[PDB]
Protein backbone atom coordinates (compact mmCIF):
# COMPACT_ATOMS: atom_id res chain seq x y z
CA UNK A 1 0.00 0.00 0.00
CA UNK A 2 2.98 2.34 -0.67
CA UNK A 3 0.75 3.98 -3.33
CA UNK A 4 -1.98 4.40 -0.65
CA UNK A 5 0.68 5.96 1.65
CA UNK A 6 1.65 8.28 -1.27
CA UNK A 7 -2.08 9.10 -1.68
CA UNK A 8 -2.22 9.85 2.09
CA UNK A 9 0.83 12.15 1.63
CA UNK A 10 -1.04 13.78 -1.31
CA UNK A 11 -4.12 14.10 0.97
CA UNK A 12 -1.89 15.80 3.60
CA UNK A 13 -0.64 18.16 0.83
CA UNK A 14 -4.33 18.68 -0.15
CA UNK A 15 -5.06 19.45 3.54
CA UNK A 16 -2.27 22.06 3.52
CA UNK A 17 -3.83 23.43 0.29
CA UNK A 18 -7.25 23.40 2.06
CA UNK A 19 -5.68 25.40 4.95
CA UNK A 20 -4.30 27.84 2.31
CA UNK A 21 -7.80 27.96 0.71
CA UNK A 22 -9.27 28.64 4.19
CA UNK A 23 -6.62 31.40 4.64
CA UNK A 24 -7.65 32.80 1.20
CA UNK A 25 -11.33 32.68 2.35
CA UNK A 26 -10.21 34.42 5.60
CA UNK A 27 -8.34 37.01 3.44
CA UNK A 28 -11.55 37.58 1.40
CA UNK A 29 -13.38 38.03 4.75
CA UNK A 30 -10.48 40.29 5.91
CA UNK A 31 -9.70 42.66 2.95
CA UNK A 32 -12.62 44.52 1.28
CA UNK A 33 -15.04 43.81 4.21
CA UNK A 34 -17.65 45.81 2.18
CA UNK A 35 -17.13 43.41 -0.75
CA UNK A 36 -17.47 40.50 1.68
CA UNK A 37 -20.85 41.84 2.83
CA UNK A 38 -21.88 42.37 -0.80
CA UNK A 39 -20.95 38.76 -1.58
CA UNK A 40 -22.90 37.69 1.51
CA UNK A 41 -26.00 39.43 0.16
CA UNK A 42 -25.36 37.98 -3.31
CA UNK A 43 -25.06 34.42 -1.97
CA UNK A 44 -28.22 34.94 0.09
CA UNK A 45 -30.06 36.11 -3.04
CA UNK A 46 -28.73 33.12 -4.98
CA UNK A 47 -30.02 30.99 -2.09
CA UNK B 1 -31.20 46.96 -21.41
CA UNK B 2 -29.26 50.20 -20.89
CA UNK B 3 -31.07 53.36 -21.96
CA UNK B 4 -29.69 56.88 -22.04
CA UNK B 5 -31.26 57.38 -18.63
CA UNK B 6 -29.76 54.05 -17.54
CA UNK B 7 -26.33 54.91 -18.96
CA UNK B 8 -26.27 58.08 -16.87
CA UNK B 9 -27.45 56.06 -13.86
CA UNK B 10 -24.56 53.62 -14.29
CA UNK B 11 -22.19 56.57 -14.71
CA UNK B 12 -23.42 58.05 -11.42
CA UNK B 13 -23.30 54.81 -9.44
CA UNK B 14 -19.76 54.34 -10.77
CA UNK B 15 -18.34 57.82 -10.13
CA UNK B 16 -19.53 58.97 -6.71
CA UNK B 17 -21.17 61.60 -4.52
CA UNK B 18 -18.93 64.44 -5.74
CA UNK B 19 -20.82 64.61 -9.04
CA UNK B 20 -23.92 62.86 -7.66
CA UNK B 21 -24.71 65.94 -5.54
CA UNK B 22 -24.69 68.22 -8.59
CA UNK B 23 -26.74 65.67 -10.51
CA UNK B 24 -29.26 65.56 -7.65
CA UNK B 25 -29.53 69.35 -7.47
CA UNK B 26 -30.04 69.35 -11.26
CA UNK B 27 -32.23 66.23 -11.08
CA UNK B 28 -35.51 64.86 -9.69
CA UNK B 29 -36.36 63.09 -6.46
CA UNK B 30 -37.24 59.65 -7.82
CA UNK B 31 -33.98 59.36 -9.75
CA UNK B 32 -32.06 60.68 -6.73
CA UNK B 33 -33.55 57.91 -4.60
CA UNK B 34 -32.96 55.37 -7.39
CA UNK B 35 -29.24 56.19 -7.37
CA UNK B 36 -29.26 56.11 -3.56
CA UNK B 37 -30.69 52.58 -3.70
CA UNK B 38 -28.13 51.69 -6.39
CA UNK B 39 -25.37 52.89 -4.00
CA UNK B 40 -27.02 50.93 -1.13
CA UNK B 41 -27.34 47.73 -3.25
CA UNK B 42 -24.97 47.43 -6.27
CA UNK B 43 -24.24 44.23 -8.29
CA UNK B 44 -23.34 45.77 -11.70
CA UNK B 45 -19.57 46.17 -11.00
CA UNK B 46 -16.88 44.65 -13.32
CA UNK B 47 -13.19 45.47 -14.06
CA UNK B 48 -14.01 46.07 -17.77
CA UNK B 49 -17.48 47.55 -17.00
CA UNK B 50 -16.08 50.40 -14.82
CA UNK B 51 -13.45 51.32 -17.49
CA UNK B 52 -16.16 51.26 -20.20
CA UNK B 53 -18.28 53.53 -17.92
CA UNK B 54 -15.33 55.99 -17.66
CA UNK B 55 -15.01 55.86 -21.49
CA UNK B 56 -18.78 56.55 -21.86
CA UNK B 57 -18.40 59.46 -19.37
CA UNK B 58 -15.43 60.76 -21.43
CA UNK B 59 -17.69 60.50 -24.54
CA UNK B 60 -20.45 62.49 -22.74
CA UNK B 61 -17.79 65.01 -21.56
CA UNK B 62 -16.44 65.45 -25.13
CA UNK B 63 -19.94 65.48 -26.76
CA UNK B 64 -22.94 66.14 -24.44
CA UNK B 65 -20.78 68.39 -22.21
CA UNK B 66 -18.34 69.23 -25.06
CA UNK B 67 -15.83 70.17 -22.29
CA UNK B 68 -17.87 73.38 -21.61
CA UNK B 69 -18.09 75.60 -18.46
CA UNK B 70 -20.71 74.55 -15.84
CA UNK B 71 -24.06 74.71 -17.72
CA UNK B 72 -26.45 76.77 -15.50
CA UNK B 73 -24.67 75.07 -12.54
CA UNK B 74 -22.08 77.72 -11.55
CA UNK B 75 -23.17 79.96 -14.47
CA UNK B 76 -26.55 80.75 -12.80
CA UNK B 77 -24.53 82.11 -9.81
CA UNK B 78 -22.49 84.44 -12.11
CA UNK B 79 -25.84 85.30 -13.81
CA UNK B 80 -27.19 86.22 -10.31
CA UNK B 81 -23.94 88.21 -9.72
CA UNK B 82 -24.62 90.17 -12.97
CA UNK B 83 -28.29 90.52 -11.90
CA UNK B 84 -27.10 91.91 -8.52
CA UNK B 85 -24.62 94.20 -10.35
CA UNK B 86 -27.57 95.39 -12.54
CA UNK B 87 -30.97 96.76 -11.35
CA UNK B 88 -32.49 95.19 -8.18
CA UNK B 89 -34.98 93.05 -10.19
CA UNK B 90 -34.60 89.22 -10.23
CA UNK B 91 -35.72 88.94 -13.91
CA UNK B 92 -33.41 85.87 -14.26
CA UNK B 93 -35.40 84.16 -11.43
CA UNK B 94 -38.66 85.14 -13.22
CA UNK B 95 -37.17 83.66 -16.46
CA UNK B 96 -36.34 80.49 -14.43
CA UNK B 97 -40.04 80.27 -13.37
CA UNK B 98 -41.02 81.00 -17.02
CA UNK B 99 -38.77 78.10 -18.11
CA UNK B 100 -40.65 75.71 -15.75
CA UNK B 101 -43.95 77.38 -16.77
CA UNK B 102 -43.29 76.86 -20.51
CA UNK B 103 -42.16 73.27 -19.84
CA UNK B 104 -45.29 72.82 -17.68
CA UNK B 105 -47.46 74.29 -20.49
CA UNK B 106 -45.94 71.68 -22.87
CA UNK B 107 -46.50 68.98 -20.20
CA UNK B 108 -50.08 70.25 -19.76
CA UNK B 109 -50.52 69.74 -23.52
CA UNK B 110 -49.11 66.21 -23.25
CA UNK B 111 -51.12 65.15 -20.21
CA UNK B 112 -54.81 64.33 -20.04
CA UNK B 113 -57.19 67.24 -20.79
CA UNK B 114 -59.85 66.25 -18.25
CA UNK B 115 -57.27 65.82 -15.50
CA UNK B 116 -55.91 69.24 -16.45
CA UNK B 117 -59.44 70.65 -16.25
CA UNK B 118 -60.19 69.21 -12.81
CA UNK B 119 -56.78 70.42 -11.64
CA UNK B 120 -57.70 73.88 -12.96
CA UNK B 121 -61.46 73.92 -12.23
CA UNK B 122 -60.79 74.75 -8.57
CA UNK B 123 -58.39 77.51 -9.63
CA UNK B 124 -59.43 80.95 -10.80
CA UNK B 125 -61.53 81.15 -13.99
CA UNK B 126 -59.12 83.85 -15.18
CA UNK B 127 -56.31 81.36 -14.53
CA UNK B 128 -58.18 78.87 -16.71
CA UNK B 129 -58.66 81.52 -19.40
CA UNK B 130 -55.03 82.62 -19.57
CA UNK B 131 -53.65 79.08 -19.38
CA UNK B 132 -56.03 77.94 -22.13
CA UNK B 133 -54.90 80.88 -24.28
CA UNK B 134 -51.24 80.01 -23.71
CA UNK B 135 -51.78 76.29 -24.36
CA UNK B 136 -52.00 74.57 -27.73
CA UNK B 137 -55.28 75.12 -29.56
CA UNK B 138 -56.06 71.40 -29.80
CA UNK B 139 -55.43 70.78 -26.10
CA UNK B 140 -57.44 73.92 -25.34
CA UNK B 141 -60.37 72.61 -27.40
CA UNK B 142 -60.15 69.24 -25.62
CA UNK B 143 -60.28 70.88 -22.19
CA UNK B 144 -63.07 73.16 -23.44
CA UNK B 145 -65.13 70.15 -24.50
CA UNK B 146 -64.42 68.36 -21.21
CA UNK B 147 -65.58 71.42 -19.26
CA UNK B 148 -69.22 71.77 -18.33
CA UNK B 149 -71.23 74.18 -20.46
CA UNK B 150 -71.41 77.06 -17.96
CA UNK B 151 -67.77 76.87 -16.86
CA UNK B 152 -66.70 76.55 -20.50
CA UNK B 153 -68.68 79.65 -21.50
CA UNK B 154 -67.24 81.58 -18.55
CA UNK B 155 -63.73 80.48 -19.53
CA UNK B 156 -64.18 81.66 -23.12
CA UNK B 157 -65.73 84.95 -21.96
CA UNK B 158 -62.78 85.59 -19.63
CA UNK B 159 -60.47 84.61 -22.50
CA UNK B 160 -62.08 87.46 -24.43
CA UNK B 161 -61.58 89.72 -21.40
CA UNK B 162 -57.97 88.47 -21.10
CA UNK B 163 -55.78 91.28 -22.40
CA UNK B 164 -53.36 91.92 -19.56
CA UNK B 165 -51.04 89.11 -20.79
CA UNK B 166 -49.25 89.26 -17.43
CA UNK B 167 -45.86 89.61 -16.06
CA UNK B 168 -44.20 87.16 -13.67
CA UNK B 169 -47.51 86.34 -11.95
CA UNK B 170 -48.42 83.96 -14.78
CA UNK B 171 -45.28 81.86 -14.28
CA UNK B 172 -45.91 81.14 -10.60
CA UNK B 173 -49.53 80.30 -11.47
CA UNK B 174 -48.30 77.48 -13.70
CA UNK B 175 -45.75 76.54 -11.02
CA UNK B 176 -48.59 76.06 -8.55
CA UNK B 177 -50.47 73.91 -11.05
CA UNK B 178 -47.34 71.84 -11.68
CA UNK B 179 -46.91 71.43 -7.92
CA UNK B 180 -50.47 70.08 -7.87
CA UNK B 181 -49.37 67.28 -10.20
CA UNK B 182 -45.68 67.44 -8.92
CA UNK B 183 -46.94 65.33 -5.97
CA UNK B 184 -46.53 61.57 -6.53
CA UNK B 185 -48.36 60.76 -9.77
CA UNK B 186 -50.69 58.23 -8.15
CA UNK B 187 -53.39 58.00 -10.88
CA UNK B 188 -54.25 54.75 -9.03
CA UNK B 189 -57.95 55.70 -9.51
CA UNK B 190 -58.41 52.67 -11.81
CA UNK B 191 -61.96 53.68 -12.87
CA UNK B 192 -61.67 50.52 -15.04
CA UNK B 193 -59.74 48.48 -12.39
CA UNK B 194 -62.74 47.88 -10.06
CA UNK B 195 -64.54 46.37 -13.08
CA UNK B 196 -61.27 44.70 -14.05
CA UNK B 197 -60.77 43.27 -10.55
CA UNK B 198 -64.35 41.95 -10.41
CA UNK B 199 -63.88 40.37 -13.84
CA UNK B 200 -60.68 38.78 -12.50
CA UNK B 201 -62.81 37.40 -9.65
CA UNK B 202 -65.16 34.45 -10.04
CA UNK B 203 -68.35 35.08 -12.00
CA UNK B 204 -70.75 34.23 -9.17
CA UNK B 205 -68.91 36.46 -6.70
CA UNK B 206 -68.80 39.04 -9.50
CA UNK B 207 -72.60 38.97 -9.73
CA UNK B 208 -72.91 39.06 -5.93
CA UNK B 209 -70.70 42.14 -5.68
CA UNK B 210 -72.59 43.68 -8.62
CA UNK B 211 -75.82 43.31 -6.65
CA UNK B 212 -74.11 44.61 -3.51
CA UNK B 213 -72.87 47.75 -5.26
CA UNK B 214 -76.28 48.17 -6.90
CA UNK B 215 -77.61 48.37 -3.35
CA UNK B 216 -74.71 50.67 -2.42
CA UNK B 217 -75.19 53.10 -5.34
CA UNK B 218 -77.17 52.09 -8.46
CA UNK B 219 -74.97 54.60 -10.36
CA UNK B 220 -71.68 53.07 -9.17
CA UNK B 221 -73.03 49.53 -9.50
CA UNK B 222 -74.19 50.28 -13.05
CA UNK B 223 -70.75 51.67 -13.88
CA UNK B 224 -69.17 48.48 -12.50
CA UNK B 225 -71.58 46.37 -14.57
CA UNK B 226 -70.61 48.40 -17.65
CA UNK B 227 -66.98 47.62 -16.87
CA UNK B 228 -67.99 43.94 -16.73
CA UNK B 229 -69.66 44.30 -20.13
CA UNK B 230 -67.51 42.92 -22.95
CA UNK B 231 -69.09 42.22 -26.36
CA UNK B 232 -72.69 41.75 -25.24
CA UNK B 233 -74.52 43.72 -27.96
CA UNK B 234 -73.53 43.92 -31.62
CA UNK B 235 -74.24 47.60 -32.30
CA UNK B 236 -71.86 48.93 -29.61
CA UNK B 237 -69.34 46.03 -30.04
CA UNK B 238 -69.38 46.71 -33.86
CA UNK B 239 -70.01 43.85 -36.37
CA UNK B 240 -66.61 44.37 -38.11
CA UNK B 241 -65.11 43.82 -34.64
CA UNK B 242 -67.22 40.73 -33.97
CA UNK B 243 -66.09 39.62 -37.43
CA UNK B 244 -62.41 40.13 -36.65
CA UNK B 245 -62.24 38.71 -33.11
CA UNK B 246 -64.24 35.54 -33.67
CA UNK B 247 -62.21 34.38 -36.66
CA UNK B 248 -59.16 34.73 -34.41
CA UNK B 249 -60.99 32.92 -31.61
CA UNK B 250 -61.31 29.15 -31.93
CA UNK B 251 -64.65 28.14 -33.43
CA UNK B 252 -65.07 25.26 -30.97
CA UNK B 253 -64.33 27.57 -28.04
CA UNK B 254 -66.91 30.04 -29.37
CA UNK B 255 -69.40 27.18 -29.71
CA UNK B 256 -68.87 25.95 -26.15
CA UNK B 257 -69.13 29.47 -24.73
CA UNK B 258 -72.24 30.21 -26.82
CA UNK B 259 -74.24 27.14 -25.81
CA UNK B 260 -73.88 28.39 -22.24
CA UNK B 261 -74.51 31.97 -23.36
CA UNK B 262 -77.82 33.69 -24.07
CA UNK B 263 -79.48 33.17 -27.48
CA UNK B 264 -79.16 36.89 -28.31
CA UNK B 265 -75.41 36.61 -27.67
CA UNK B 266 -75.29 33.49 -29.84
CA UNK B 267 -77.13 35.24 -32.68
CA UNK B 268 -75.01 38.40 -32.51
CA UNK B 269 -71.78 36.38 -32.45
CA UNK B 270 -72.85 34.05 -35.28
CA UNK B 271 -73.96 36.98 -37.45
CA UNK B 272 -70.24 37.61 -38.10
CA UNK B 273 -69.39 34.00 -38.95
CA UNK B 274 -68.77 32.75 -42.40
CA UNK B 275 -72.14 31.19 -43.15
CA UNK B 276 -70.64 27.69 -43.18
CA UNK B 277 -69.07 28.33 -39.76
CA UNK B 278 -72.35 29.70 -38.37
CA UNK B 279 -74.30 26.70 -39.66
CA UNK B 280 -71.72 24.26 -38.28
CA UNK B 281 -71.74 25.99 -34.90
CA UNK B 282 -75.54 26.00 -34.69
CA UNK B 283 -75.75 22.35 -35.76
CA UNK B 284 -73.24 21.35 -33.09
CA UNK B 285 -75.12 23.43 -30.51
CA UNK B 286 -78.22 21.41 -31.38
CA UNK B 287 -76.24 18.15 -31.32
CA UNK B 288 -74.34 18.44 -28.02
CA UNK B 289 -76.03 19.45 -24.80
CA UNK B 290 -74.73 22.16 -22.47
CA UNK B 291 -71.29 20.98 -21.34
CA UNK B 292 -70.06 21.65 -17.78
CA UNK B 293 -70.62 25.27 -16.78
CA UNK B 294 -66.99 25.36 -15.63
CA UNK B 295 -65.82 24.66 -19.19
CA UNK B 296 -68.39 27.09 -20.59
CA UNK B 297 -67.04 29.82 -18.31
CA UNK B 298 -63.48 28.86 -19.26
CA UNK B 299 -64.32 29.38 -22.94
CA UNK B 300 -66.05 32.68 -22.13
CA UNK B 301 -62.96 33.81 -20.22
CA UNK B 302 -60.78 32.79 -23.17
CA UNK B 303 -63.03 34.90 -25.42
CA UNK B 304 -62.62 37.85 -23.05
CA UNK B 305 -58.85 37.31 -22.94
CA UNK B 306 -58.65 37.41 -26.74
CA UNK B 307 -60.76 40.58 -26.66
CA UNK B 308 -58.22 42.07 -24.24
CA UNK B 309 -55.35 40.95 -26.48
CA UNK B 310 -56.89 42.74 -29.46
CA UNK B 311 -57.52 45.76 -27.22
CA UNK B 312 -53.78 45.68 -26.52
CA UNK B 313 -53.19 45.63 -30.27
CA UNK B 314 -55.42 48.70 -30.53
CA UNK B 315 -56.40 48.35 -34.18
CA UNK B 316 -60.10 48.96 -33.40
CA UNK B 317 -62.23 50.17 -30.42
CA UNK B 318 -63.53 47.11 -28.48
CA UNK B 319 -67.25 47.78 -27.75
UniProtKB/Swiss-Prot annotation, chain A:
Localization per Swiss-Prot or TrEMBL: Cell inner membrane; Bacterial flagellum basal body
Induction (record text): Inhibited in nutrient-poor medium.
Source taxon at top rank: Bacteria
Could you tell me what this protein does?
The M ring may be actively involved in energy transduction.
Quote the subunit structure annotation: The basal body constitutes a major portion of the flagellar organelle and consists of four rings (L,P,S, and M) mounted on a central rod. The M ring is integral to the inner membrane of the cell and may be connected to the flagellar rod via the S ring. The S (supramembrane ring) lies just distal to the M ring. The L and P rings lie in the outer membrane and the periplasmic space, respectively.
**Similarity field:** Belongs to the FliF family.
Which protein, by its recorded name, is this? Flagellar M-ring protein
Section covered of the full-length record: 514 to 560 of 560
UniProtKB/Swiss-Prot annotation, chain B:
Q: Does the keyword Protease apply?
A: no
Which stretch carries the motif Part of the EHPQR-motif?
123-126
GO BP, one example? chemotaxis
Q: Does the keyword Membrane apply?
A: yes
Q: Which GO terms describe its cellular component?
A: bacterial-type flagellum basal body; plasma membrane
| Membrane-protein topology | Peripheral membrane protein
One MF term from GO for this chain? cytoskeletal motor activity
InterPro entries in the cross-refs: Flg_Motor_Flig, Flg_Motor_Flig_C, FliG_a-hlx, FliG_M, FliG_N
Q: Which SUPFAM superfamilies match?
A: FliG
Compartments where found: Cell inner membrane; Bacterial flagellum basal body
Q: Where is this site: Part of the EHPQR-motif?
A: 158
| Keyword list, A-Z | Bacterial flagellum, Cell inner membrane, Cell membrane, Chemotaxis, Flagellar rotation, Membrane
Function, please?
FliG is one of three proteins (FliG, FliN, FliM) that forms the rotor-mounted switch complex (C ring), located at the base of the basal body. This complex interacts with the CheY and CheZ chemotaxis proteins, in addition to contacting components of the motor that determine the direction of flagellar rotation.
Q: Which family does it belong to?
A: Belongs to the FliG family.
Protein name in the entry: Flagellar motor switch protein FliG
To which species is this protein native?
A: Salmonella typhimurium (strain LT2 / SGSC1412 / ATCC 700720)
Amino acid sequence: KDEQLQQRRANQRLGAEVMSQRIREMSDNDPRVVALVIRQWMSNDHE
Amino acid sequence: NLSGTDKSVILLMTIGEDRAAEVFKHLSTREVQALSTAMANVRQISNKQLTDVLSEFEQEAEQFAALNINANEYLRSVLVKALGEERASSLLEDILETRDTTSGIETLNFMEPQSAADLIRDEHPQIIATILVHLKRSQAADILALFDERLRHDVMLRIATFGGVQLAELTEVLNGLLDGQNLKRSKMGGVRTAAEIINLMKTQQEEAVITAVREFDGELAQKIIDEMFLFENLVDVDDRSIQRLLQEVDSESLLIALKGAEPPLREKFLRNMSQRAADILRDDLANRGPVRLSQVENEQKAILLIVRRLAETGEMVIG
